[PDB]
Design goal:
Entry title: M. thermoresistible GuaB2 delta-CBS in complex with inhibitor Compound 14 (VCC900455)
Bound molecules: the ligand O=C(C1CCCCCC1)N1CCN(S(=O)(=O)c2cccc3cnccc23)CC1, inosinic acid
Radius of gyration of chain A: 19 Å
Chains A, B, C, D: Inosine-5'-monophosphate dehydrogenase,Inosine-5'-monophosphate dehydrogenase
CATH superfamily of chain A: Aldolase class I
CATH class of chain A: Alpha Beta
PDB class: oxidoreductase/oxidoreductase inhibitor
CATH topology of chain A: TIM Barrel
CATH architecture of chain A: Alpha-Beta Barrel
Keywords: Complex, Fragment, impdh, oxidoreductase, OXIDOREDUCTASE-OXIDOREDUCTASE inhibitor complex
Order of helices and strands of chain A: EEEEEHEHEHEHEHEHHEHEHEEHEHHE
Assembly: tetrameric
Strand order of the largest sheet of chain A: 5-6-7-8-9-10-11-12
Largest interface: A-B, 52 and 44 residues
Structural class of chain A: alpha/beta
Oligomer: homotetramer
Chain lengths: 331, 331, 331, 331
């Protein structure tokens, strides 16, 4: 084997990230303004804009969830707070009209009680929220939830980075599979644990397991430009989950921070020391971006342009677009 | 598939840009001073120097077009101004002697009226000027123009980045095909839309569709050194269109700008916020370079050297030169 | 041959280093806190933590060796000092309880006398400590030691970077093979001699020769993050030897250095001019890190996380994990 | 074709430079101090140290040539000066004992008269000194010289970067072939003309044409570390020509320059504007390095280390060593 040893499976794949590829233009009759940006968040729930906000305590509380839903997407309420408080945020969102909202749960002992309280509060989507879903306890939580509240609530499972992991969540009954182990902007898992999977390759692999079963893939983490959203969907994802890109907005939790005459907001990993109080995230800053509505408009504008270039009238068509792989020189 | 999924066509190609390749020397009897630099701009029009200036409002108005033609190349007048004004610039160039000149038109409603006014003003080349020519409206404009004014005016279509797109323009009747989706120095399409195609690969693909029909390819965008002009022609292009390399010249529109004791001129994308008033270009600065005549001399000097090294007595011979692909270490 | 010449064996392999790969997650029932981190240092000696400290005079003297053993690993006492002094450090470690300790010897004339003095002092592991073990004098020293004191003392040989070299040490009777020619943080062999072998590939190759004979591989050099320890073990190593990561600790030799308001300690190659008094190492600084116990806890924490992600209940299982190769864009 | 077009020969090779490869250690009985560093400069002339100084006016005049010969290598006197003056420098070197010396000639009209004057002055090696030897005028000069003064003087031809070019010089009668089109530290040919060939690949290709005819290859340009000398010889070169590495020495032409409290010397391309008075070189600075004797000692020390690691008792053995290719991450 050219890279060493005698086992060709030891190095299993060549992993591409977003910066490794570009979308190829294709024959087009599609005007960006007329493209249909709607897409499946789960088997049953279709969003007008294929974007959801991360379940992080510097990204999504009630204010963000409301703004995301109004913009045509959805928020996923973080779970780094008491059950009663998270449930009250669900109620707060549902009081602001017929707005979709999701909420994160874990797989701990209090996870089941948290999920039932969220159901009682009227939540539409429960996100079983882990860093590694390929695990009996996670698969069991997904299955138990689906069998118990599945008629009324859609159950998302994640995160995965391999085909087999995605397959396991599908068999467990997930209504959507969330992809991303290691790609987050504030992630240190790759240097702390040495574990990860570049996100374009991870999406391609997850989609190979989910699409034949009609299960939507959520691309979670590593998106830094509006162009990355188009790439994620073209790789086969149905929606993208965003942390860093939304953390700088007025609707995100937290105050403005002034450093060197410039405005920022804090953005921290849920695995950072601060969030937990062996960290796998950092605490950082992102530039202040203004209102969420305007950020979403710019992000969707980029996606619409990609749909024009690729001749994709719908997200389903964009999922069939082709890539070109680029070199380092294509900085 | 090593990069993910089960579909080998999902990632269609490995895209090389100019920095990825070098020209290999070959047996030579050619002195740089004696090389013939003439090349086809279109099926009928041959230039003494294979260079045209970009149709941008910080690069080509009448003064630039006149200087380019005198230097043996051609200018393409930008269209970010009223029809009457653009037509008056055509007249101004034709009044300065028997000088070749081209002018950009769009595919909007006013595009046809613009084209006829340019024809009346005496224009030699009409450039159907879009970011994505693989589109019924663009192909129809090219065809209508060719059938209507084709005997007197050469019609250029662009831009394309794929073989099929170039083929479609050829069938539509284009007299030259312009290549470049995403490579421009001031371009943000790659980060906004996630769309693009590295330019050496794009030229190779376009040429595979155009050369068998005797249609010249114009390499448009991403050229930053005189050496890139040689590479573009060796990949099979017949001419190169330059923006950044000519924007710093005395003949370009705009004033000198002094920052930190150094001289610059503004250079902005036609898709920048400033030009349009979702932007796909930026507004920037380029160093002031002095007279156009001298810049062209230096650029052509580099091309002549390449022709000496490769034993290319003509541009047609240079189009048959070979490359070596380099690694990152070859910075 | 695509890279030149007619001999496909001239460029023998594509060498990967730690930054070239990530560990893929796999099905897991393993809790990080419950993972078994024990591993073979040699055929007979198993450590609770698979880490040993480098035999360098800015890393391991008696204080470090004691702390490493207490933390569940081991120290290898450097040999840049008189035989009597090194032997006294062995005694000092053994006086602090039933603590494992190793000590470096060379292959010079005084090497044999040094080894016997270390044996008399009660050493558990002798490390035949060279930059290139594939050499008759090194193989002879390993063999002589094994045959003479092998019943009481384990003999480590190194360093190697190729399969054949590792094979030769195995046949010579080594109880463990140490891998690393050129990867050290303070190493200049790669620029001075142009010699080296990227460490993931070197480990894969050494393991292919050692594992079928039941001989553990020690990955030595180039480890800069806790994640690199997981990668080294997953490539097939049984332990990792650390220099830079431990040189900043309270237990390492040397004083604190203050530069620009920040605390550092000196860290220098044993091939640096300072250590020898043609250098193949530099003298540098590393940040002060505090107590060794805490550094080891953080390093092992990272390893435990990797074992959770990969479903590895033991180091033997981690050695069967798979990689994904990443590109430059995966910075 | 994956990179574009339908012609697999368009991109002819993947070109490696020195930074792309490392030498693999191999079984060794060779002590660095005992390695034989002698090598053929030409078919007849063997040097004790396989190094020659560049024919540049900031590197080699009489003082450098004398010092190089005394160190066991050779200097090649530059030709950017009157014939009488260059010839007087030859005389000056021969007056300092039985010291080998070479001198550069061109292929212009005055080239023949220059060569005869150098022969009369007692020169040992004539270097036909061009940037592209694959040319009838260069091949004719080599042949004419060999047939006219070949019994007394060795004739070097260069530069080449391809197998066919090297073959042509061999057939012309060259006693050594010099390799390097574009790799020089002060070279801008790659950005001006877009022409070049990475040096490890260029050496491998030239050697494939020269070695079967017993003609030594001189690796010229791009060497920045002592380790690059080992790599060049291992790729099959017999000697290396150095510019930048020797330009900082006391024996090089020019004065010391003080900038920001540090000592430098000027180093400029023979194709720089300053040397010619379309430039293909720059004028730069290199750090002051002290006496040549000491620089050579350090360079040879590195080579000796490489010979120890690779088990090469002679340069002929080193030419049979193997490489490993490294990635970008192996910075
Ligand atoms: O429960 C774990 C264990 C994972 C399973 C394997 C054993 C290691 C621990 N966590 C807790 C959550 N995360 S995280 O907050 O950083 C995280 C949050 C969501 C998405 C992630 C995607 N990739 C990395 C980290 C992510 C860290 C690790
Ligand atoms: O009309 C469009 C639409 C393109 C078709 C697909 C839908 C998206 C919009 N424009 C308008 C012009 N450009 S541009 O000015 O930036 C532009 C000018 C010329 C050459 C380009 C080459 N590559 C990128 C941008 C370029 C932006 C996009
Ligand atoms: O004895 C030698 C000879 C090596 C054999 C081939 C001939 C060259 C000399 N030494 C002495 C020790 N080292 S070192 O201290 O830098 C060193 C220490 C341990 C691990 C090394 C791993 N890779 C590089 C250097 C290393 C330098 C060279
Ligand atoms: O005579 C030429 C022509 C070359 C043949 C093809 C046509 C172009 C001109 N020169 C003159 C010398 N050089 S140089 O001084 O820069 C030069 C000096 C030696 C080694 C070189 C190696 N690679 C690049 C430049 C080098 C520049 C070009
Ligand atoms: O602490 C952490 N370490 C690693 N990943 C995290 C952490 N916290 C959240 N994440 C994940 O990173 C995603 C956000 O990534 P981003 O959009 O690139 O910032 C989130 O939706 C999580 O999947
Ligand atoms: O705003 C923009 N975004 C992307 N491409 C542009 C824009 N404006 C002009 N272009 C194209 O970029 C070319 C100039 O590229 P440059 O020579 O690299 O600066 C132009 O000829 C256009 O094809
Ligand atoms: O001077 C030197 N040059 C090259 N390698 C060295 C030198 N001194 C020690 N080493 C090796 O580098 C290892 C430490 O590497 P590190 O952990 O990356 O700093 C040591 O255990 C040695 O194998
Ligand atoms: O002006 C120039 N441009 C390109 N190459 C040059 C020039 N002048 C000298 N050279 C070549 O560069 C070699 C020195 O390269 P260096 O050792 O990397 O600095 C010289 O021996 C020449 O072959």
């Amino acid at each position: 084997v050219p890279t060493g040893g005698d086992d060709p499976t030891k190095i299993a794949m060549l992993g591409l990230t977003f910066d490794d590829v570009l979308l190829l233009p294709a024959a087009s009759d599609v005007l960006p303004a007329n493209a249909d940006t709607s897409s499946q968040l789960t088997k049953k729930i279709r969003l007008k804009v294929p974007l959801v906000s991360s379940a992080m305590d510097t990204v999504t509380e009630a204010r963000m969830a409301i703004a995301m839903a109004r913009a045509g997407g959805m928020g996923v309420l973080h779970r780094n707070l008491p059950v009663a408080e998270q449930a009250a945020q669900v109620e707060t969102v549902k009081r602001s009209g017929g707005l979709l909202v999701g909420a994160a749960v874990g797989v701990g002992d209090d996870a089941w009680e948290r999920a039932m309280a969220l159901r009682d509060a009227g939540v539409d989507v429960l996100v079983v929220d882990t860093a590694h879903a390929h695990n009996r306890k996670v698969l069991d939580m997904v299955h138990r939830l689906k069998t118990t509240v599945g008629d009324e609530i859609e159950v998302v499972g994640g995160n995965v980075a391999t085909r087999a992991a995605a397959a396991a969540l599908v068999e467990a009954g997930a209504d959507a599979v969330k992809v991303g182990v290691g790609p987050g902007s504030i992630c240190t898992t790759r240097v702390v644990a040495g574990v990860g999977a570049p996100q374009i390759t991870a999406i391609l692999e997850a989609v190979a397991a989910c699409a034949p079963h009609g299960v939507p893939v959520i691309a979670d983490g590593g998106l830094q430009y509006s162009g990355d959203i188009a790439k994620a969907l073209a790789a086969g994802a149905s929606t993208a989950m965003l942390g860093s890109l939304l953390a700088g907005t007025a609707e995100s939790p937290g105050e403005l921070i002034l450093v060197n005459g410039k405005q920022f907001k804090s953005y921290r990993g849920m695995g950072s020391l601060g969030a937990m109080q062996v960290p796998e995230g950092i605490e950082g800053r992102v530039p202040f971006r203004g209102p969420l509505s305007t950020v979403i408009h710019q992000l969707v504008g980029g996606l619409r342009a990609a749909m024009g270039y690729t001749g994709s009238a719908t997200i389903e068509e964009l999922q069939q677009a082709q890539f070109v792989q680029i070199t380092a020189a294509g900085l």
